[model samples]
Target chain A: VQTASVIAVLGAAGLAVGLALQGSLSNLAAGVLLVMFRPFRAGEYVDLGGVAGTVLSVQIFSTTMRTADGKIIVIPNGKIIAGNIINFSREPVRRNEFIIGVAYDSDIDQVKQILTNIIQSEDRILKDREMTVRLNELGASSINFVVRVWSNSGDLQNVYWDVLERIKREFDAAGISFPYPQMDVNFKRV
Target chain B: VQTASVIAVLGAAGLAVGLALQGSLSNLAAGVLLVMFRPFRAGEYVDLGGVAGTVLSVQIFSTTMRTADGKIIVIPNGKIIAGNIINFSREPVRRNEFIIGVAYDSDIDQVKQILTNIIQSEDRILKDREMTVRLNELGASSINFVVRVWSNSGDLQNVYWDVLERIKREFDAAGISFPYPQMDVNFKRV
Candidate 1:
């Protein structure tokens, strides 16, 4: 009877521990998956479930990140492995894209020519890689162009902002106006 | 010896099954946790790990969602429980905000008064809740105002677009110009 009781007590203790620490256990399991999969490593820029930052370390239960603005984020491994993990640093050359909208009346060919000139002139842009500039969407208030260029991963943001600044200046010089959200209202007489 | 061989075979089978099905089993466990905790319910709009959609059904291993554009998303419960779940429909009213940037020379008081009038006139806006319009930031090229309003969950998008349309019209009528990204370039001949 004592032996039977002791066995029953041990089983109950195991059940209690399993139930109490299931979250941590699941996280540990996911951590193993992450470490084994090796999707990202330390010092890589990744977007883990919308949290964009540079990874610091991948621990057993959690992953640490240092954001661009210098904030430390500790995310549980369970979440990282469960959700979409976008590793931006996977490719040495990254593509920077912009969707610029000009007034509907603006000439599409002229816009394309200006964009081509800007991309060709930019020294940081990867020349051998394909450069795309096309009319992709006709928005409600503006005509949108899908402008894309390849650049070294480290210079991605610099090329993005610089291209936009250049386009704005060129558009201004050429009298191509950027359209704002527009609407018409009519007064009804009672 | 026969009994011992049988036990060994059974152990090997158990080990293989356990190794093969651990991921699905953990997801099932997490599904149970989610249902028991009751963080969100069916038809609620939630942002689960950057995937925003309306919950269709919560199942044993996966939660299905119908996104705003009508695409179905089946997320594993393991991922859902691990990441942040933002339930936008939990509250009776939701807040919608816009950051309106105007040229540096525009009058702040005028902008505030116009936005207040627009919010007061919109029928979809929640009248009982607080509405805010204030100068929040001094941007590089433009001054920014924070315009926020409370609205019913279903009417959130409608109210958001409507307010923007109204603001654009009012600002245009008042001769206020929206600012685009600006940079100055100087030429140097070496």
Candidate 2:
């Protein structure tokens, strides 16, 4: 009788625990999956679902992330595993791309050369990797050029800032204008 | 011996299932917790953790959110439970506040009067709630005024746009300047 009662108590406790920790257990399972699959690691810049940040630590039940703006986010492992994981710094090198817009009247070849020159001048831009600058589309307000350059993941931010500042200076010297959004305003006296 | 073997097999299978489904089970538990807590419901605008969107539905494992721009986001229950939730639409009314900056030289009293008149003219603004218009700060380039008004949650967007545009027009009429960032650059020829 004692043995039977002990077994009954064990079963009830198991059920209670199972019911209580359903959410945490799921997160724990996802954590194991993340470790097994090895999609990302600590210090990598990743876009998990829509939250883009640098992975701080992948814990047993949750992953801590630090945003570019220095906000710490603790995300459950279940959500990280369930959604798409984008590891931006998976490879040592990353491609930086930009869509630069200029006035329609500006010379397309001049724009391409200026963009290309800016990237070529930057020391941080990976010389061995592929780079391209081309007039890709005619947008509603301006002509758009697609600028692509490869850089070491760590140097991305510096390269971006330098490229933009130099582009502005070069464009100004070349008399190429960046078009603002054009809108019409009409007023009628009541 | 036969009974002992059967029991061992059952235990092993249970262990395997528990290990495999830990993440999903946790999320399920969290979903139950969310429902029980009643922090938010369908059609409410909530800032779940960091995601700001309109709640479409709260399901067993995930919550469906539709952003103002119409992007559907499926958030796992585990993540929702792990972070802070700010329900913007929990109350029938919401407070809308803005920091409007004007040229430092503009009359501070005039700015306050203009802002007060704009909110007073709007019928949708909640007159019963606290409304404030005061010169709050002397900013780097502009004098900043804190303009606050209470309005029905549904009428918030309309009132925001009307207030901003009207303020701009009225400020222009009053000869008050909206100052942009200004810097002095000195170039030395190398």
Candidate 3:
């Protein structure tokens, strides 16, 4: 009877230890899921659990992510399941947006016209969608407007560089003033 | 009849414009995919289409990724579909490999035993699997081997720090010489 009781106790203890180790087991299982499912792979830019970066390596329990500023983040898979992920390179198409702030004193209608013409003339711009030129935000110093345009995501940096240069030229010629924070000095009374 | 012909011509012209603008439209569509599907999200580290970083923002046309080194990358959605993406935050578990180089003549078995013990003793290690230690490489300066263990991704860096320190201590106690790259200079006998 004592021998049977001892065996039973040992079995119960083993079960308890296994139960206590569930968290680690879960993590290991999650690591396996990460490798097999392949939602995201190394060297791609992704947003996971609100942290975004280029994935450097995928280890068993953690993912190594590198931020643009050059910091490495090791994230646990359990935390990932609880968070959201966004991958930018999963598609070939992407869009670009430019927020242009103008001075309140400048003619809003003229500014709009100038921007419209620039979009129409730019060779790189896609013309099907009506170009949006509307007040987006009223900042402390300027009336902010957004120019949201669509383009191929591949080599987008060059397109942004080119389009921005053209917008500046067109807006400058029309005297559609871009605003910056400034103050006027009064010298007489004091 | 004349008006009908003009309308037909106009329709044809519109089609041409649409065809020309297909590239931009694809980008717009890709943006929608990123927003809708959400393989990853902002602030998480990701590697997409060979670019890696923390996602700064997700806009309609493109997603902004920031690297840890302080550079911001704006990627369009279209390119994302064309390549591979790796997300580390998808799961919490990661497998880590630590390389420890020792003198060529050291007893390999003793080194392995000490390393295994240190790894086993670390609090952060996952208990499901035994750590694998073996001679992985014979390098120019030393006999290089590896310690492979599993841990939670969140504690990856900390685990590395702890295990490395433990390994050094254990090796020192066992009198196992650590191999370091060095240059030797011997003057010829006069």
Best by TM-score: 1
Evaluation by DockQ, superior candidate among 1 and 3: 1
**Per-residue lDDT tens digits of candidate 3, residues B84-176?**
456666656777888888865677668877887787778788888657686665444565777778788779889888888878787888899
Q: Chain B TM-score of all predictions, in order? A: 0.86, 0.84, 0.79
- List the candidates ranked by TM-score, beginning with the highest: 1, 2, 3
Judged by DockQ cut-offs, is candidate 2 incorrect, acceptable, medium or high? Answer: incorrect
- Per-residue CA lDDT of model 1 for B1-190, tens digit only, reads 4655655565555555554566776678778767875667898777787798899999988899999999999999877766766667555566787999997567767887899999999999888877768665545567577776878877888889989999999999999999887544334433
Off by over 4 Å in 1: A2-6, A185-190, B1-100, B104-190
Judge candidate 1 at residue B133 and give its lDDT: 80
Query: Which ranges of candidate 3 are over 4 A from the true structure?
Result: A1-190, B1-16, B181-190
Instruction: Write the residue-wise lDDT of candidate 2 on B1-190 in tens digits.
Output: 4454355456545765685586667878999999998788888889876768788888876677765433455677887888888987778898888777776677888888888898899899999988999889887656778878999898886687667657755776788866654334455556
Measured against the true structure, the TM-scores of the candidates, in listed sequence, are 0.52, 0.51, 0.45
lDDT of 2 by residue, A114-161 (tens): 777888888898898767675554444565777778787778878888
